[PDB]
Paper text:
Green fluorescent protein (GFP), discovered from Aequorea victoria, emits green light after absorption of blue light. GFP has a β-barrel fold, and the chromophore is formed at the center from the three amino acid residues Ser65, Tyr66 and Gly675,6. Spectroscopic measurements of the photoreaction of the A-type chromophore revealed the presence of the excited state proton transfer (ESPT) reaction, and a photoreaction model was proposed that includes the intermediate (I) state in addition to the A and B states.
The A state is stabilized in the T203V and T203I variants of GFP, while the B state is stabilized in the E222Q variant. The conformations of the residue at position 203 are gauche- for both. Gln222 in the T203V variant and Glu222 in wild-type GFP are in the same conformation as Gln222 in the T203V/E222Q variant. This indicates that the conformation at the position 203 is the same in the A and I states. On a plot for the two structural parameters, the three states appear in different regions. In other words, structures spectroscopically suggested to be in the I state (T203V/E222Q and T203I/E222Q) is positioned in the low right area in the plot, while those to be in the A (T203V/E222Q at pH 5.0, T203V, T203I and wild-type GFP) and B (S65T and E222Q) states are in the middle-high right and low left areas, respectively.
Author numbering: 2 to 64, 68 to 231
The structure:
Amino acid sequence: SKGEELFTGVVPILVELDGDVNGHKFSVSGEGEGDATYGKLTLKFICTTGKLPVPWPTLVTTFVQCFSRYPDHMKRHDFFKSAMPEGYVQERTISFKDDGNYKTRAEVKFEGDTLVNRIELKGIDFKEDGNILGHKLEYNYNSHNVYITADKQKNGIKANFKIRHNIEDGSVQLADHYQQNTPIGDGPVLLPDNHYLSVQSALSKDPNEKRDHMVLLEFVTAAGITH
Ligand SMILES: [Mg+2]
Ligand SMILES: [Mg+2]
C-alpha cells in the first residue's frame, strides 16, 4: 500500500514538543531516524528552554509508532503506516499514580521525506515534591507492551498500557496510558484486529552534550497475531 512503502528504508524523524506542567512551560526539539524494517528508532532530544522541569523518562512515550516492525503476516493491521503520508492525530491521557496527569495531542505526518511528530502537552495536578516535579525517577526505561484495538467510529485505533518508571528508592511510579489515534487524510486506513506492540527502550546521554537532553534507542515489534 501507499503508506507502508514510505517506510521500507531509513526515514529521518523530527520531534517538536511544547509543554506546560503545573505552569512550568518548556519546549523540546528532537532529531533522529527510524528503520521500520527492523522496528528501530534512534532519537536525540534537547530541552531548548533550559532545564526540563519533569524527568526525561516521563516524556519517552509522548516523543512515532509508524516505525514499529509489523511482521509481513500482520501488515493488514498496521494503522500507523496506512495513515501516511497525511498522518494521524495521536492523543493520550497519561495518569501518574498518586500524582498528576499529562494530556497530549500530537500530529504525526510527513513533511517532505521527513516524519514529524508535533506535540502539545499539558500537565496538571502534580505534587510539588512528587516523583515527577521532585525529579525522583531513575534515568532508564523498562520494556512494555502497547495493547491496540480498533476505533471504527473515529476511523482509527485506541490503545491502553501501563508504563512503570523506576524510582530512585527502588520503587516504581506507574503511568497509566490511554491513547486514541485518528487519521488526518482521506486515504483508506487499516482498522486492525487486537494486537500489541512489544517495546524496549534504552536511554543514554551524549557525553559531549551540555544542554539538558536525552538519547533514546528503541525497538518495537508488533505481535499477538499468529496468521
Ligand atoms: Mg518489509
Ligand atoms: Mg477477522
